[PDB]
Amino acid sequence: KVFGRCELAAAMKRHGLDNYRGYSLGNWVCAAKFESNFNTQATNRNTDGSTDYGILQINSRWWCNDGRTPGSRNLCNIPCSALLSSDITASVNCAKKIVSDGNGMNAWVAWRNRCKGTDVQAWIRGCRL
Numbered sequence: 001k002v003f004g005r006c007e008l009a010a011a012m013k014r015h016g017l018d019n020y021r022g023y024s025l026g027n028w029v030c031a032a033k034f035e036s037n038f039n040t041q042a043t044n045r046n047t048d049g050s051t052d053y054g055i056l057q058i059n060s061r062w063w064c065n066d067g068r069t070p071g072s073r074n075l076c077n078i079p080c081s082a083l084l085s086s087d088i089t090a091s092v093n094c095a096k097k098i099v100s101d102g103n104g105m106n107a108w109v110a111w112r113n114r115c116k117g118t119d120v121q122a123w124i125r126g127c128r129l
């Protein structure tokens with residue numbers, strides 16, 4: 001599923017991401033825009049052989065099991081394919097564990113390089129929430 005900007009903001013708010021660990025809703029929408037272009041089916045392979053999955057591009061090296069990343073962890077206790085669903089629940093629940101691990105949203109390279117220090121409120125402007 002390819003979400004609209006306000007559609008995704010509303011789904012993320014309903015799932016508890018507004019101000020989660022201090023990160024306003026616009027930070028999460030900006031991250032998803034630049035990680036996946038709002039597409040739940042996005043995948044990208046990394047140089048180390050791991051793969052990133054879904055709307056927030058969660059990495060199989062640490063967070064999910066895809067059967068093809070030797071010696072990886074599965075810290076969210078899910079198959080990576082669960083992160084490509086049109087229902088964003090699994091991706092949101094896993095992102096909450098990531099953002100809590102000490103490094104905040106710096107775990108998402110595109111957030112660090114394209115959202116951090118910008119006016120992220122613009123990503124929810126006009127939306128009914």
Ligand SMILES: [Cl-]
Nearest residue numbers: 024025026121
């Ligand atoms: Cl915001």
Ligand SMILES: [Cl-]
Nearest residue numbers: 067068069070
């Ligand atoms: Cl594996």
Ligand SMILES: [Cl-]
Nearest residue numbers: 022103104105
């Ligand atoms: Cl933080």
Ligand code: NA
Nearest residue numbers: 060064072073
């Ligand atoms: Na893994």
